[PDB]
């Protein structure tokens, strides 16, 4: 079965680790990768990488984003020992300090090289962290999409929209780690499960080698037009950069009882095809899991932008 692995880079990084692996992922492998050793200490990957002692002494980038490039192209032959093995690498930073900014698309890089698809889920800072945070980001977002198979941004400046003002930091902190969590969640169901119309690894491989932008989403509904609202919540993404008008390709699968119907698929169908409002190259799976009752779920991967 295909070996998934889920990377955080710097602070941003290894606290949605840290807060993935509380939620419980049971077969994904974690990696916690920082130049901050005190951060790194508190991880709780099974594998962790100090980077940059020589240059930090122990310390993070301090903002620098070279500092973060220059501590990963050297523990470079550490960083490949912890991904060798991997078919699927997804690398999760916060874009704008030194340590994600620099390291991140370095262990991208890798990844590709060590053979993996890699995915990188990035976050942009909040607009009142100013202008320099914010072009520091933007280069190390430019320098993501370079490395790596597909990129999910996630510009911090939304969860502003998800919030009301009372929300805690850190509950808008895991809306924006569901992104990445689910859609983690979501390859590994695809991988483990036989569906009556069946997708697998090689399926997601064309749909996101070497594609660019990315979205990842998934819609679970009950009751009359559960279909249609599963579809409508997998494709919504208040938190995304790229929504899903202008995807091309587009891998869907749809989860449901014994009652699931052939209507109600091509009704899903649809509303991704329309969203997208282009033709879709889609790949169409389904799975029929007798447990479920009136429950459906849709999974997106929608690229191609
Ligand atoms: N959404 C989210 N953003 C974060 C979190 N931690 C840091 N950030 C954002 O990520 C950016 C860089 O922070 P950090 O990862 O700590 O910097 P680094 O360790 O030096 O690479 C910050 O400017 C924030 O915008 C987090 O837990 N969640
Ligand atoms: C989330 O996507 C998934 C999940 C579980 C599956 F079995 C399949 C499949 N049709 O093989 C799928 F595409
Ligand atoms: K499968």
Do not use: C, W, Y
Request: no cysteine; aromatic share 2%.
């Amino acid at each position: 079965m295909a070996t998934l692995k889920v990377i955080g880079v710097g602070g941003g990084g290894n606290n949605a680790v840290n807060r993935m692996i509380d939620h419980g992922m049971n077969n994904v492998e974690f990696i916690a990768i920082n130049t901050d050793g005190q951060a790194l200490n508190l991880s709780k990957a099974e594998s962790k990488i100090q980077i940059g002692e020589k240059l930090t002494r122990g310390l993070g980038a301090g903002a620098n984003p070279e500092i973060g490039k220059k501590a990963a192209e050297e523990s470079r032959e550490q960083i490949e020992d912890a991904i060798q093995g991997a078919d699927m690498v997804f690398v999760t930073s916060g874009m704008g300090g030194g340590t994600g900014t620099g390291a991140a698309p370095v262990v991208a890089k890798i990844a590709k090289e060590m053979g993996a698809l890699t995915v990188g889920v990035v976050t942009r800072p909040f607009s009142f962290e100013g202008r320099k945070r914010q072009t520091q980001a933007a280069a190390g977002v430019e320098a993501m999409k370079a490395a790596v198979d597909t990129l999910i941004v996630i510009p911090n400046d939304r969860l502003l929209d998800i919030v009301d003002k009372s929300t805690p930091m850190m509950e808008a902190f895991k809306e924006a780690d569901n992104v990445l969590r689910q859609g983690v969640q979501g390859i590994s169901d695809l991988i483990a499960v036989s569906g009556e119309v069946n997708l697998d690894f090689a399926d997601v491989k064309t749909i996101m080698s070497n594609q660019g932008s990315a979205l990842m989403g998934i819609g679970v509904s009950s009751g009359e037009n559960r279909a249609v609202e599963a579809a409508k919540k997998a494709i919504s993404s208040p938190l995304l950069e790229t929504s899903i008008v202008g995807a091309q390709g587009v891998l869907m699968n749809i989860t449901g009882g014994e009652s699931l119907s052939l209507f109600e698929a091509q009704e899903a169908a649809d509303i991704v095809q329309d969203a997208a409002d282009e033709d879709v190259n889609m790949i169409f799976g389904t799975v029929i899991n007798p447990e479920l009752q009136d429950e459906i779920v849709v999974t997106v991967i929608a690229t191609g932008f």
